[PDB]
Design a protein around this nucleic acid. Sequence first.
RNA 1: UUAAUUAUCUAUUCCGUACUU
RNA 2: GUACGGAAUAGAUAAUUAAUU
Length: 155
Amino acid sequence: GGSLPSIEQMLAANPGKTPISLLQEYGTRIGKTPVYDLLKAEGQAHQPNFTFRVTVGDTSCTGQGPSKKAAKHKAAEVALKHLKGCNPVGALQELVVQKGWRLPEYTVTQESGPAHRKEFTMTCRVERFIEIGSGTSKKLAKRNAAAKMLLRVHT
RNA sequence: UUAAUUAUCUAUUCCGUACUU
RNA sequence: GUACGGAAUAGAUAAUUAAUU
């Protein structure tokens, strides 16, 4: 024995990872390697679209998204199935500036999460209002802190 | 040696919104 | 003049997984 879990069980063993990384682990057991190809790269520089294809043995599938991370993610998940066979920060800036208040400021108040995934806690400050948010990135903690503050400063 | 993934920093290119002059 | 967001490319740093030497 000592063999790896089934292709269904490995999904539940590491559901926090991308389907790309699970295909990279599964490929070695079957003697295949998931080859990744960029099928499309176009956009109006404001709403672009990308396409990825993945190849595993005698099978290949595609996926798309507004970024190469989202497009590769969709193409990878599709292979496992066959193998199993507006800005809140900007909206706040417009609100604070329209009411005649001073510009907002952002500062990190905490850090957590292991370095392979990370997390952050960010604070927002306004002329008299203050609020906090969190996320896997400083900008992502900022967008959350702004989203909660939009409820604080608005009616 | 090869493949896959997140975060931080720096540089380059493109695009949008608000405020001010 | 100031503030904010999105996509792509390059360099540096930290972390995680699989295969191989």
